[PDB]
Give the backbone structure.
Amino acid sequence: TREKAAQGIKAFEELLVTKWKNWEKALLRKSVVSDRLQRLLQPKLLKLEYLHQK
DNA sequence: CCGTGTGTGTAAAGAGTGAGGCGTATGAGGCTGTGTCGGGGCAGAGGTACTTACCTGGCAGGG
């Protein structure tokens, strides 16, 4: 299995394709939005906390 | 008269929840012990009609 993984190979699990469900699309939209917000907020939150501690 | 454009069977995926049994984990029980801490009483400050009597306002005199 080592030799087969090397030289490249596609195991059966890695080839499974599941058709995307309607609700998964909304879930991904909400996920992207929320994580973009968190990444934008973390810097300002740390800035504010540092200012308060100062 | 042979092109093609649409239907159809029926189990095969595709999810989509849902269910059931089993196996592991937990508990409860005295026991005995030892540090500790919330706890839970524990009392405690500390905040219907008629008649008679009594009181008040008024006008009156007195000095």
